[PDB]
Write a structure and sequence with these properties.
monomer, alpha/beta, TIM Barrel, 8 strands, hydrolase, Beta Barrel, monomeric, PlyB
């Protein structure tokens, strides 16, 4: 199976086919407060029916600490409560003190009831945004063709993956000290 992040850019998957291909999906809820991803709810319905494990992500656009809290509350309310975890996707310097904004976003998710929150940080932004200082459950970093130079529990390694039932797809692999069971809650022995 693959660990795939998905959004409206993935169109209309053949979920019965994608089922046998998927370990875990992370689907996009929003890009900032004012763009709601229009396929998210449909994707979640399809994955629940098929018992495809999923978490949720939001692309962050916050310009201050208090604005980060609003954006996080939008993410939580628009996202499905059966999400296995919730990811802040921080790639653009939308306010100077990105560590403060990011931590406020994360903290609002926890206050709202989120149990597991992750940080996806853009390439080259790990040190810029003070990711080492962020308090959250896991980190996720892209680097194509090569292992990231920074620690991460999830590594996005290909933006041009091809997965049966989905087509062109962002592919991820575990890369840290968390197992797949840590994410899905499954267990086998």
């Amino acid at each position: 199976g693959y660990i795939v992040d998905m959004s409206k850019w993935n169109g209309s998957p053949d979920w019965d086919t994608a089922k046998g291909q998927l370990d875990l999906v992370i689907a996009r809820v929003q890009d900032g407060s004012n763009y709601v991803d229009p396929v998210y709810k449909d994707y979640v319905a399809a994955m629940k029916a098929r018992n495809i494990p999923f978490g949720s992500y939001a692309f962050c656009r916050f310009v201050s600490v208090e604005d980060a809290k609003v954006e996080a509350r939008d993410f939580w309310n628009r996202g499905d409560k059966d999400s296995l975890f919730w990811v802040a996707d921080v790639e653009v310097t939308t306010m100077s003190d990105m560590r403060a904004g990011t931590q406020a976003f994360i903290d609002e998710l926890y206050r709202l009831g989120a149990k597991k929150v992750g940080l996806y940080v853009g390439h080259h932004k790990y040190e810029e945004f003070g990711a080492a200082q962020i308090k959250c459950d896991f980190t996720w970093i892209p680097r194509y063709g090569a292992k990231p130079a920074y620690p991460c529990d999830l590594w996005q390694y290909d933006e041009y993956g091809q997965v049966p039932g989905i087509g062109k797809c962002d592919l991820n692999r575990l890369n840290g000290d968390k197992s797949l069971d840590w994410f899905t809650g499954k267990g086998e022995e």
